[PDB]
Design a binder for these strands. Structure first.
Lengths: 142, 38, 209, 175
RNA sequence: UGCUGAAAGCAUCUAAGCACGAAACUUGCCCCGAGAUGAGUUCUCCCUGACCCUUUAAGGGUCCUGAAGGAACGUUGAAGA
RNA sequence: CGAUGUCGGCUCAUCACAUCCUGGGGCUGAAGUAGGUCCCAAGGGUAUGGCUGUUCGCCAUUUAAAGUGGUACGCGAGCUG
RNA sequence: GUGAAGAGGGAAACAACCCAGACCGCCAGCUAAGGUCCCAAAGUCAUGGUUAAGUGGGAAACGAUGUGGGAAGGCCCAGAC
């Protein structure tokens, strides 16, 4: 008897909604990445995306401890010779708030096509409302 | 302003204050006495 | 503030009674007929879309014909768009003529520049030629070196090399408007604007004041 | 500590309003407000206010002393108010008030007109004196600092705006 | 560079709170830009037939039909190897 | 060591700041003009000639300035010899 | 002692360091060094402290009322700072 393996067609995925108000960024991101990977389900398989879809709202109100709010720099290189950009945490929150959560989760996920596939199910919004009311997401207290 | 690695008091009016995690010496009497650790 | 769409008639000069010869470019700016008004409620931003000139009735395809027909306006030779400033309204069938620029002092003219085809580095980026003598071997106008020896073992992005020069959008900023001739749909701007004769030009009020 | 131990006496005609940490003090010279730090425990003993360290914070006494001084300054403001006097030194230097804008002429090629805040009023007894008045100590100090900042007093002759009480250490120019 | 202010009865630009400050940073000026696979938005146009088969399903096949639009060909361009 | 072409020059650069100029500031044995020194700042700019193969250097005359360095003391499957 | 002549696990990667010596097969169990939030298997484990520097996650002479614990000492309600 060989071990059970999930199948991409018959795997069921549920929709959840998380309120990111005042929660620690990394401590929320770990649970988010774990659920997107599917490690919270007994039917987990490393090469199958068995996770759930998660909608994260109120992303622009996420909290950090210490002096990270003004000192955490997000570096990225454009590929050109002088293109070294940088942006502090507060600048990222003010300019593109969703990117903070996106970069954090993407960093905590595996790398490769399956990793990008897992990442595609996270839909994060700056405000308090989403357009996915049709899918009926359950409120998840992380 | 003297930017030194060793900042000390130079007279009775020199007062040591730590501003923004930097040790600084400020003197009410002599402007030549003000230094900052750097 | 919005701008208008005209056509480059050519270049000439205007003589002033003080004895100064101003070189001007004659832009024929016919009436711009609005064809669609975009708003925050439907498009998420405020702008108008205008057209000008005429087009052959057997050359206008059915999608754009229906688009013009909805507005109830005869087909023009193109469609251009202008972002609306705050507190500036326009109706759908409205026609805007060259008298809009009656009291502006400087404009920004943007057009598609002349095409120089495949241009060398010397012509395109003002590189220096090498020696025409002194023993030089087949390297009179080549670009020379393009990198360093094995530590950055690649050529850097954004390097200046030979390629297609021109035939791209170019904006010339802060030109003085010499004369607005509303009677015959003319606009004379001081200086030289990009583009060959007969091309389309987009004239907008100067952003830099 | 020692500053926080001594309570402040609230005079007659001055009503306080404690709402958690945010406190308002109304009086004849206006009504000031301030949001206190959560680590300070303040209470009104029916004729005076007392300040104590709220438990669970290391810097209790320090914040308490800071809070004591702030509310004491507020009480001084709402009864007597603060008057800051500045004087100008130098030929051709002068000031004038037009309702709520001070017009300074400090030897510049243009006029320098500073807009005053809501609760600050100015008055020039002479051409070279400015008298600022207000309830809030921090605001009147800040406006005084900004006015002196335009032409800070140089050491060779003392030319520029200066406070009435402060001394300028004159330095001799050795040739 | 400061205002108010304790720790530290004083002093103190800082520990709580508030203000100013450079060609550096982010915009503001110009251009490319939804292959931004996260492939977006808006306006408009076109197609409104009958049937067979077996492994019955985003299945295959026949007849009629060929639109909007595109491509090809030709005369060509201040566009272009 | 069954080959990693080397000094200087030409063409083309790119990065670091221990900044040459412009920008902000403290002290001055800073009256002013003009300076000395240190801190912040790499956005842009940073000569032409006489002599020698010269790098370096001296000299003439400008410039706000004629920076110090890294890149196989950058660059010969780009040129010279 | 190891490598040479030695594979496996850890130190990111890393012949020589640490743990440990591969006869072959198994979709069985227990541990060593090293770890137990996610990449990536395992404690968001329990009790009591320390740090506010992203110190942890690179360094010295020297400088500093940063802050936790312990034993003394000099002045002091004949009044100390």
């Amino acid at each position: 008897m060989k071990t059970f393996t999930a199948k991409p067609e018959t795997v069921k995925r549920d929709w959840y909604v998380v309120d990111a108000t005042g929660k620690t960024l990394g401590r929320l991101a770990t649970e988010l990445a774990r659920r997107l990977r599917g490690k919270h389900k007994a039917e987990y398989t490393p090469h199958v995306d068995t996770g759930d879809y998660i909608i994260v709202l109120n992303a622009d109100k996420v909290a950090v401890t210490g002096n990270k709010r003004t000192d955490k720099v997000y570096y990225h290189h454009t590929g050109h010779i002088g293109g070294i950009k940088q942006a502090t945490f507060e600048e990222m929150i003010a300019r593109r708030p969703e990117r903070v959560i996106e970069i954090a989760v993407k960093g905590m996920l595996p790398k490769g096509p399956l990793g990008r596939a897992m990442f595609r199910k996270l839909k994060v919004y700056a405000g308090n409302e989403h357009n996915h009311a049709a899918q009926q997401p359950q409120v998840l207290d992380i | 302003m003297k930017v030194r690695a060793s900042v000390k008091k130079l007279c009775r009016n020199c007062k040591i204050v730590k501003r923004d995690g930097v040790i600084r010496v400020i003197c009410s009497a002599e402007p030549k006495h003000k230094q900052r650790q750097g | 503030m919005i701008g208008l769409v005209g056509k480059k008639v050519g270049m000439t000069r205007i003589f002033t009674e003080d004895g100064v010869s101003i070189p001007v470019t004659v832009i024929e700016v016919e009436a711009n007929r609005v064809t669609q008004v975009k708003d925050l409620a439907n498009d998420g931003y405020r702008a108008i879309q205008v057209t000008t000139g005429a087009k052959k009735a057997n050359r206008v395809t059915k999608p754009e014909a229906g688009h013009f027909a909805k507005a109830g306006v005869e087909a023009g030779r193109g469609l251009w768009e202008f972002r609306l400033a705050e507190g500036e309204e326009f109706t759908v069938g409205q026609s805007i003529s060259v008298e809009l620029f009656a009291d502006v002092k400087k404009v920004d003219v943007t057009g598609t520049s002349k095409g120089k085809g495949f241009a060398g580095t010397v012509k395109r980026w003002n590189f220096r030629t090498q020696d025409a003598t002194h023993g030089n071997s087949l390297s009179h106008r080549v670009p020379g070196s393009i990198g360093q020896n094995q530590t950055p073992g690649k050529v850097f992005k954004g390097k200046k090399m030979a390629g297609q020069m021109g035939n791209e959008r170019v904006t010339v900023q802060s030109l003085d408007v010499v004369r607005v001739d509303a009677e015959r749909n003319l606009l004379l701007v001081k200086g030289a604007v990009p583009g060959a004769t007969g091309s389309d030009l987009i004239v907008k009020p100067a952003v830099k004041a | 500590s020692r500053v926080a131990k001594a309570p402040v006496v609230v005079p007659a005609g001055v009503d306080v309003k404690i709402n958690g940490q945010v406190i308002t003090i109304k009086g004849k010279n206006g009504e000031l407000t301030r949001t206190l730090n959560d680590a300070v425990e303040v209470k009104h003993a029916d004729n005076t206010l007392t300040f104590g360290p709220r438990d669970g914070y290391a810097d209790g006494w320090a914040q308490a002393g800071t809070a004591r001084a702030l509310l004491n300054s507020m009480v001084i403001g709402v009864t007597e108010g603060f008057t800051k006097k500045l004087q100008l030194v130098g030929v051709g230097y002068r000031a004038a008030v037009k309702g709520n804008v001070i017009n300074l002429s400090l030897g510049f090629s243009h006029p320098v007109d500073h807009q005053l805040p809501a609760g600050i009023t100015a008055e020039c007894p002479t051409q070279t004196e400015i008298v600022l008045k207000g309830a809030d100590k921090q605001v009147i100090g800040q406006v005084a600092a900004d006015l002196r900042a335009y032409r800070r007093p140089e050491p060779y002759k003392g030319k520029g705006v200066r406070y009435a009480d402060e001394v300028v250490r004159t330095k001799e120019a050795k040739k």
